[PDB]
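re: that complex we talked abt at group meeting.

here r the seqs, copy pasted straight from the sheet so there may be weird spacing, ignore it
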Amino acid sequence: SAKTNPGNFFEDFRLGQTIVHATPRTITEGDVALYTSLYGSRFALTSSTPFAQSLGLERAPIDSLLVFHIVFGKTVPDISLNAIANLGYAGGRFGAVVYPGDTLSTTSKVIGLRQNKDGKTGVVYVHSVGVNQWDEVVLEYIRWVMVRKRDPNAPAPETVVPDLPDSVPVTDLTVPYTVSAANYNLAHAGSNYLWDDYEVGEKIDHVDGVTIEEAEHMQATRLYQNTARVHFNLHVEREGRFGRRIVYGGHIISLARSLSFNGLANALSIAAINSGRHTNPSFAGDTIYAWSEILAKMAIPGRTDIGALRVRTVATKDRPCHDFPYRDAEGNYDPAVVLDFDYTVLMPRRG
Amino acid sequence: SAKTNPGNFFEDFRLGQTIVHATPRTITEGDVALYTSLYGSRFALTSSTPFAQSLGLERAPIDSLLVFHIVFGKTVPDISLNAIANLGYAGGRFGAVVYPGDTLSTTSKVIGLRQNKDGKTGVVYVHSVGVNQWDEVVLEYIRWVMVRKRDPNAPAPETVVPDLPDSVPVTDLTVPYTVSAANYNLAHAGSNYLWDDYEVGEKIDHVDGVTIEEAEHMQATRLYQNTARVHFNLHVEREGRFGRRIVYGGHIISLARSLSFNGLANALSIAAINSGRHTNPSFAGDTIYAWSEILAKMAIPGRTDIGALRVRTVATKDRPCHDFPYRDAEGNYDPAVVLDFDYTVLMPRRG
Amino acid sequence: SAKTNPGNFFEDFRLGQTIVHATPRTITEGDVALYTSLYGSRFALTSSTPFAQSLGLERAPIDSLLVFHIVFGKTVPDISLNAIANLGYAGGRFGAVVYPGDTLSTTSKVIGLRQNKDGKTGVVYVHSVGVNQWDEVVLEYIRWVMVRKRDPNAPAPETVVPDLPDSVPVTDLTVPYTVSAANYNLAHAGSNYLWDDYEVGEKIDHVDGVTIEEAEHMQATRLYQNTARVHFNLHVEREGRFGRRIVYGGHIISLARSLSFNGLANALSIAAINSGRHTNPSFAGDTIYAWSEILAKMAIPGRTDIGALRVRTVATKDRPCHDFPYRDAEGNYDPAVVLDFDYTVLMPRRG
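got the structure back, here u go
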């Protein structure tokens, strides 16, 4: 009897099953430095312990997206090892703050199944939950993936598709730090623009472009202990249609967030992920650019020191001539667009 | 008088000489994270402090192979700077557990010399010993290397070839942690298969393949402070026969071990290295695959919670069509085989 | 109103203005390990906490050049984002020792301006100062950069060019540790050659060559949170004259220092930078070699355990046939020379 883990194929999933993932992970200062070296994020909250402490935190917290990729990575062996694509995310709520020394474990529950019409693949919806060593939820989200059937002839499960929240409600957001004007260094943060100064509907060109190297995305993907084979195996991928390894979609999210520092410097942390589409594949040699739109501005119940912004950041490769490329082609994404990421940031307010 | 260190050439070695190596090295959480990011190892013991503590350890220990490469790397300037190849390892016994914050220093003793028949090179056998800051041995092993003679005409030393142990005896293995069923999370470890469930002679295909990047092996080699010039210098190596830099053999060992997680997840740590042959050179652009055989299963004297398995892991590049490639050609390794690694793991037993 | 930071162009600078830079940075053991993995530095002071403690330090200090690149990187968004080239450094004095856990912030003052004769660019001189969380200066230096004018027609500022020190005076050097023969392990340090044994005017060939990978310099540059766009953007740089990304000049400094270990092993730390010229651009695929000259030997006032050496290290690419390439062409640097770095090291003296 085979000792190896073939992962799950579509027909292997059962509605309501809970999967306890392997490899709980202690997150350390080594992880923090690697993440910095891979994306260049300049957000002051994660770079400086004294800055984080002036906001009432114990020390600089782990980047929310580093938390996300680690939680996501744990689920890969059991959920997406045999997936064609990730199809979306919803209800991504960040919970307790994560600090160096904390240990995360992940479990996933199947909350939806739908065999595709061609009968060769199916969509599985999972609710994934990451907890720390105290059993506090640090992150929960829903994602859905298109997964291969091992046997095309296997019977279809009954279709169950869950209702998906459009966004994490502002009343569900964790706001784990506190800001006072008397204690917030704008020069250190990197911008004079605060929550009050952003205009709903405004678009922001982040300007910078960064080229992806093979060693770079593989190294981030290994940091996440994410094992999906399209990222790693040139011997196989070279025979595939693209003929090259595919960059982990979350690597693009992390680059876009880093680039967004140019124009969203006071967006100190990500408090929720509302949706995310990896609209086209990204490859080593592609240069990633980003732009953002302020979709909405929302007050935080009970707080006037910090507000929320709902942001769409769109990543493109090798930026084309028309500014702010999106969906010119009647709902169809521009071929240059690789990421459509809709999330909620916290930003200090004027006092 | 030259201020530089030319290393030793074959005629420079003296039977019985002890060399105290430079650059003692404190191993930190930054080293741990880098090692994870370079090999993607998912073994639960090294990834989680609470998991390691439930086994009675202080915190997650340093990966045995990270310990190995660091000890090995220290010896490179004095032993193998002028080597053509490493020829083998024997009696590699892991001693005291290594934790973040510990500092390793290495010494080597010459225990064998044999000038080659063509008189252009010679074989030197060394016993290398790594100790921590408390002077406890954390690792000892024997290796032998083919080293260039600086002067072809220099007189041959008297041939002395030591007796080499076939394996580290099970009675010599350190078993630094303790397992109880009541306290061992199988889902977290990543497999239901325990020591009792493995069959002697069984072969395990680890399935996954991973492609080596230049930046990747150079970065691991620098982490080890290993200075061998074939790894680094394209200007020189490009003129060589292979016409490209050569991947540190130990990088292949570390990849194979990582890949072995798929099928040997409960092999929590490596307790001994019995032999190791780098059968063919490996290069950036090669995709590494692995398979393992259970050579033997052995009880640990005085213990029923943990057992030993003697494992051969064979790494191949760009896996050929016949499964489990080894030595079809009458003792000659298949051209695809790059590593033949024979070692002993500890695995929890059923209670 | 644009939310992004266009940086400063030449006409934007005002004599005497102080710029407080963004992104204060806590330096951790993760940064230490990454720096090791990127340059392979074997200097014993930074690799071993017990070695550093035997010299009276708290623990192993952060590499002086890691401190330098971080301080430098912070200034990039405001000073050199729109620069054509860095033109020189002067009066680079290292102050308080930096340890893991310390946090650095940087400010720059404009101390000089001179519009170039073609009126398209100008030279700006800055005094940059890095302090730790206790407001102690850990590094100060002067650098000057050639910066683009946004508007060629903008009026020239009045020319003010500061007097530049030729070197940091020996009386200004911080000597933060203490050596005694009774407590200095030469084998661990890596050389028997001490301050007394070096000859003024002697030249040292460091022998080793190392090839730069794209992922490697980008990763170092991100570790420094240095955002200059020539390092990152192939989409843009591919259209440029060189047609490829340009390696951060400080990456070359750090490689040269690492290579210098072969011949300057007891040069335990860099106490000052006197001048530095990036004489030709460096690119991924270039192999870097180094050689050094002992320019001067100086006693440290009040101390006989440690002395200073003023060193020139010259880095070359793909080393040409004539040894010690420098300025054959009548003041013009040899096309192979990429770095001319003049600095002061501390070295233990014989007792």
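couple things i noticed - The helical segments of chain A are 29-39, 44-47, 49-54, 64-79, 186-189, 214-223, 234-237, 249-264. The longest helix of chain A spans residues 64-79.
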